[PDB]
Amino acid sequence: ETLGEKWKKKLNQLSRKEFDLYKKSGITEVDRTEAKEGLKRGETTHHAVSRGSAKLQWFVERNMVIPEGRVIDLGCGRGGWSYYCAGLKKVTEVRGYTKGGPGHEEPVPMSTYGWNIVKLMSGKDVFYLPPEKCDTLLCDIGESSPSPTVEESRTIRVLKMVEPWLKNNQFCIKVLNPYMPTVIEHLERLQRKHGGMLVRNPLSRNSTHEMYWISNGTGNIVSSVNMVSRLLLNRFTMTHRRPTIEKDVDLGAGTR
Ligand SMILES: C[S@@+](CC[C@H](N)C(=O)[O-])C[C@H]1O[C@@H](n2cnc3c(N)ncnc32)[C@H](O)[C@@H]1O
Ligand SMILES: O=C(O)c1ccc2c(c1)CCO2
Ligand code: NA
Numbered sequence: 001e002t003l004g005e006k007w008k009k010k011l012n013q014l015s016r017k018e019f020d021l022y023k024k025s026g027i028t029e030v031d032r033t034e035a036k037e038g039l040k041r042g043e044t045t046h047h048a049v050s051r052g053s054a055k056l057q058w059f060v061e062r063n064m065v066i067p068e069g070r071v072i073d074l075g076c077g078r079g080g081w082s083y084y085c086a087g088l089k090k091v092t093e094v095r096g097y098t099k100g101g102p103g104h105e106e107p108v109p110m111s112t113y114g115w116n117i118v119k120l121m122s123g124k125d126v127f128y129l130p131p132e133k134c135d136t137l138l139c140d141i142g143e144s145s146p147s148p149t150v151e152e153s154r155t156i157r158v159l160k161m162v163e164p165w166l167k168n169n170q171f172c173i174k175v176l177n178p179y180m181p182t183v184i185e186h187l188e189r190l191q192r193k194h195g196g197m198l199v200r201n202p203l204s205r206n207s208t209h210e211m212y213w214i215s216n217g218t219g220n221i222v223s224s225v226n227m228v229s230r231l232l233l234n235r236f237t238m239t240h241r242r243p244t245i246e247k248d249v250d251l252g253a254g255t256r
Contacts (some may be wrong), residue, residue, distance in 0.1 A: 006178025052080025142176025
């Protein structure tokens with residue numbers, strides 16, 4: 001049994017009270033107060049529509065993925081990754097696809113900087129989408145489940161779906177459950193072919209073992225995964241730590 005499986009078993013034993021205290025213990029998070037107030041009022045400038053804009057910004061500002069040209073955003077949801085990319089100097093077009101409907105977030109129309117180069121299409125299940133040419137491939141799909149075998153299936157399906165979209169382009173892909181041995185086998189094969197590295201984002205919650213496969217980096221995937229399992233396991237043992245609060249992103253206004 002992997003360390004990740006030990007973490008998942010312990011996570012599943014927590015009461016709701018224990019789970020709520022654990023899920024943000026020692027994590028980093030942006031203060032969404034201003035954005036949530038503005039969005040409730042229907043404000044369309046400055047605000048990021050979700051925590052995802054800051055989450056992708058964390059990788060971009062570290063050069064782990066450098067969006068450029070035509071960006072595809074799979075599983076765009078409200079559009080946080082797409083609206084953030086729309087303001088980036090090298091980006092020329094953003095196309096987001098998301099399922100929408102019951103149980104799924106719908107794109108939020110916004111007027112943040114570069115809105116005019118964004119097209120968010122809902123009602124689209126990416127598992128039936130044929131691949132398109134793009135310079136940047138983003139994917140943030142992977143629904144958590146108390147079952148790690150359900151998560152394993154979900155993760156392998158995303159990895160198989162994204163591959164034909166990868167053609168010597170920039171990429172950032174969520175890996176929901178990176179610790180199951182079958183997933184590690186696929187990730188090692190994918191890294192041999194397309195390069196990149198698996199990275200844990202400090203803005204992820206402790207309630208998920210997600211890591212992101214980014215294009216600009218190198219390293220040992222197994223080492224990186226076990227490092228996260230040990231980190232998350234130890235966070236159960238530690239006294240509660242309020243999250244490290246950071247300022248949310250201002251996505252401005254205007255067209256380009
Ligand atoms: C983690 S959220 C993405 C958040 C987004 N990156 C942001 O910044 O707002 C993942 C999204 O994937 C969508 N999704 C899940 N399965 C999907 C599928 N089969 N096809 C398309 N979208 C899907 C979900 O509805 C959800 O909105
Ligand atoms: O959970 C952590 O992020 C963490 C990092 C370093 C460290 C600890 C926790 C306890 C002693 O050293
Ligand atoms: Na929803």
